[PDB]
């Protein structure tokens, strides 16, 4: 195949520098017409950031000109983005992308941005990295038994985003709902819920797997009936 | 700069319908017989994916269900017929000049038949209580339309303090919406009451949906 991978910090204190890396696997940066950088703020607003031509030259969005710089490394085949004097308005998801010749018309090319990386979430804050507290949410133990059961687990008080929740190490895909986090006093709260048939739980239990990469935290809370 | 005004922001189309996203530009965007507009669609948690480019040339791997057209300052994208794996945000974008720019996007939500919220309420985990805090969680799952009104009620009295809610987008499968509502309290405040009610108010019902419990 051909894939680009953004790599870099999750949390940068304001007034420092952002240095992201985009690793290009299966294509020499040289074979590229141009490699870009784009970021997307909360609310999904997209902003083209700048790029570096195959001729090693660059072009940057004016609004950032003063403090942005895009370079590359032929030998390791990855290009970089550096951004100076980061403020809270620099918190968004960053993506590197490729621009290439696309067959337009007859025997004619047309350049466009066709392959993008996963994106990496960068948080600009002075707050500290906090591991989450994971709490199992088992059905009331009175309001249970009947029909189809809804289970769930609360992930509270962590920073920064993100955190991944899955069930039974990845099995349970259907019936799962994961709600976007919410900030209250600079710590996150998020809850995931899974609706299973009254056949499995209790016997043949479920477990929520929470992984908070910024704090290298991986927690497994096995949901069990309440003794209420 | 060149501004891209997309219309409209919100668009709801039931299955097998016709989706029509416009996208006007501040200056014209043609040149040498090519029109530098493109379209990407982004699904929640995914990178934008290139659909059409150069106004009408569809990118390989894309179902011929999608259509691109327009010239000068006006452009357009249409879906025929709208599928479930078509709920996303579409963004037009110009490669006419640097700096390249994008539009705001258009959330395409698929219409479905009214469905009611399967409410579910949970008391604090015995582990949280030890920790002193006290979260009471209420999931309002798989409903439609997206408009629901949730109200918490302790011993008959309403309570907005400690309440944080969150929503998911359209659920790619059943095209429904879900919601979490969390009431956070101190162990001493939870214990200072009995009845705890989550009360939903939805289009699919006349009387609210209650679901509660009491520390007893």
């Amino acid at each position: 195949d051909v894939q680009l991978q953004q790599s870099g910090p999750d949390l940068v204190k304001p007034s420092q520098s952002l240095s992201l890396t985009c690793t290009v696997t299966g294509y020499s940066i040289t074979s590229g017409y141009s490699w870009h950088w784009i970021r997307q703020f909360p609310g999904n607003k997209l902003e083209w950031m700048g790029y570096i031509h195959y001729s090693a030259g660059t072009n940057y969005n004016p609004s950032l000109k003063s403090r942005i710089s895009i370079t590359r490394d032929t030998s390791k085949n990855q290009f970089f983005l550096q951004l100076n004097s980061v403020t809270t308005e620099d918190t968004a998801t960053y993506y590197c992308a490729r621009e290439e010749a696309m067959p337009y018309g007859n025997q004619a090319y047309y350049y466009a941005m066709d392959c993008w990386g996963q994106g990496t979430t960068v948080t600009v804050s002075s707050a500290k990295t906090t591991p989450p507290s994971v709490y199992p949410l088992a059905p009331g133990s009175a309001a249970q038994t009947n029909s189809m059961v809804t289970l769930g687990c609360l992930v509270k008080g962590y920073f920064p985003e993100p955190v991944t929740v899955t069930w039974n190490s990845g099995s349970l895909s259907s019936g799962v709902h994961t709600f976007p986090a919410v900030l209250q006093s600079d710590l996150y709260t998020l809850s995931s819920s899974v609706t299973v048939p009254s056949s499995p739980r209790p016997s043949e239990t479920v477990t929520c797997n929470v992984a908070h990469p910024a704090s290298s935290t991986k927690v497994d809370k096995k949901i069990v009936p309440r003794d209420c | 700069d060149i501004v891209l005004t997309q219309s409209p922001a919100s668009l709801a189309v039931s299955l097998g319908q016709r989706a029509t996203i416009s996208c006007k530009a501040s200056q014209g965007v043609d040149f040498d017989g090519a029109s530098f507009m493109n379209w990407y669609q982004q699904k929640p948690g995914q990178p934008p994916k290139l659909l059409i480019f150069a106004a009408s040339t569809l990118e390989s791997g894309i179902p011929a269900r999608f259509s691109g057209r327009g010239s000068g300052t006006d452009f357009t994208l249409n879906i025929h017929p709208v599928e479930e794996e078509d709920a996303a945000t579409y963004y037009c974008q110009q490669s006419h000049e640097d700096p390249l720019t994008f539009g705001a996007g258009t959330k395409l939500e698929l219409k479905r038949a009214d469905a009611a919220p399967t409410v579910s309420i949970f008391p604090p985990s015995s582990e949280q209580l030890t920790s002193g805090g006290a979260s009471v969680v209420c999931f309002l799952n798989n409903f439609y339309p997206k408009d629901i009104n949730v109200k918490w009620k302790i011993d008959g009295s309403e309570r907005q303090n400690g309440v944080l809610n969150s929503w998911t987008d359209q659920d790619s499968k059943d095209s429904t919406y879900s919601m979490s509502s969390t009431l956070t309290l101190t162990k001493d405040e939870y214990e200072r009451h009995n009845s705890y009610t989550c009360e939903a108010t939805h289009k699919t019902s006349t009387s609210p949906i209650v679901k509660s419990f009491n520390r007893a």
Binding site: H53, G57, N59 | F31, A34, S95, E97
Partner: peptide, 11 residues
Amino acid sequence: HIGPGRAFGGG
């Protein structure tokens, strides 16, 4: 088939 405002072309 690179826009007139693009800083770089390619041929």
